[PDB]
């Protein structure tokens, strides 16, 4: 009975230099309970307590994994603490590496031309990212982007286009109105899932 339940599960959720640890609370958690988060760099048998007590279900581990893209990854564990008792540790099921990072774009700029609409994709430049590590620098080859284009006025429908450059063009066949765009990034050799960008529109008129 004197036992304190361990977090049901611990997993990473990350984007380029935004490595957030996540976990499920123990059942029937009192408010005096918090979680101790620890870390381990694969290759070094050494667990490093990062936070001794966090009253939340997530934790930004970026700062302590800034060398993820030049490493073999990490392992993170969480345990419950209440008074002078603590649960067993609950470790991530898989080694967190660049393979578990969700690709995203920094933003999208749109300009209107003759029958062309010039599009430029701004890759993400997070703060926490050291200069030596730019998106292009890490993912130097095979960067692609799926594009979705919606017309307005109009219904919620999209034309899909596939590009392999941060820049692309859109044919304004001979229409007017607003044109909304969203892009999802990817790396041809990697299987990393990606996320659609916040739509970006432009009034042709």
């Amino acid at each position: 009975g004197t036992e304190l339940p361990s977090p049901p599960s611990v997993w990473f959720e990350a984007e380029f230099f935004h490595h957030i640890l996540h976990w499920t609370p123990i059942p029937q958690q009192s408010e005096s309970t918090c979680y101790e988060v620890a870390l381990l760099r694969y290759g070094i048998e050494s667990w490093n307590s990062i936070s001794q007590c966090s009253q939340t279900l997530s934790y930004d581990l970026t700062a302590v994994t800034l060398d993820l893209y030049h490493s073999n990854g990490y392992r993170a564990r969480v345990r419950a603490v209440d008074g002078s008792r603590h649960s067993q540790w609950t470790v991530t099921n898989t080694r967190f590496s660049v393979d578990e990072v969700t690709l995203t774009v920094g933003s999208v700029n749109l300009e209107i031309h003759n029958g062309f609409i010039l599009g430029k994709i701004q890759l993400p430049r997070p703060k926490m990212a050291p200069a030596q590590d730019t998106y292009e620098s890490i993912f130097s080859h095979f960067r692609e982007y799926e594009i979705a284009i919606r017309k307005v006025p109009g219904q919620f429908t999209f034309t899909h286009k596939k590009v392999k450059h941060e820049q692309f063009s859109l044919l304004t066949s001979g229409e007017v109105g607003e044109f909304c765009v969203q892009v999802k990034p990817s790396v041809a050799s990697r299987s990393n899932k990606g996320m659609w960008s916040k739509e970006e529109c432009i009034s042709l008129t």
Binding site: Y42, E45, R75, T94, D99, A188, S189, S191
Partner: protein
């Protein structure tokens, strides 16, 4: 081989995508934290022994590792063999286009010669032997480069 303008990526994604299918099983299974595939192996892949180092590993995985795991736990014996295929499928594409895996490529001239030698038979042992000095001159020529 079409100079491989760049058809390889799709093959690495194929390899990783195959691996993700067994990533959790083994990563939950492996509790040790020391690196097995040291970066010394990486340096070797970059040394002028790279090709040989790479061939050996692919051989190692396909012959020793995967066979022992696929069998030991049929649970994934399939999911693993699939990965194996993606691998062989990669190796094949790597050596069809020189530069990547020369060390697994047979010599054409050596092939024709072995055949011309077989097409002779009795007269072949005699001509190969009496041309030995030409052999030495070739070998010697080689070294002088």
């Amino acid at each position: 081989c079409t100079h491989f303008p760049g058809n390889l990526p799709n093959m690495l994604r194929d390899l990783r995508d195959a691996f993700s299918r067994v990533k959790t099983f083994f990563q939950m299974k492996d509790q040790l934290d020391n690196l097995l595939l040291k970066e010394s192996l990486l340096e070797d892949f970059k040394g002028y022994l790279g090709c040989q180092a790479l061939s050996e590993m692919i051989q190692f995985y396909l012959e020793e590792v995967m066979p022992q795991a696929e069998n030991q736990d049929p649970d994934i014996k399939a999911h693993v063999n699939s990965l194996g295929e993606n691998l062989k499928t990669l190796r094949l594409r790597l050596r069809r286009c020189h530069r990547f895996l020369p060390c697994e490529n047979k010599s054409k001239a050596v092939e024709q010669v072995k055949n011309a030698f077989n097409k002779l038979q009795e007269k072949g042992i005699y001509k190969a032997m009496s041309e030995f000095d030409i052999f030495i001159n070739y070998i010697e020529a080689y070294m002088t480069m």
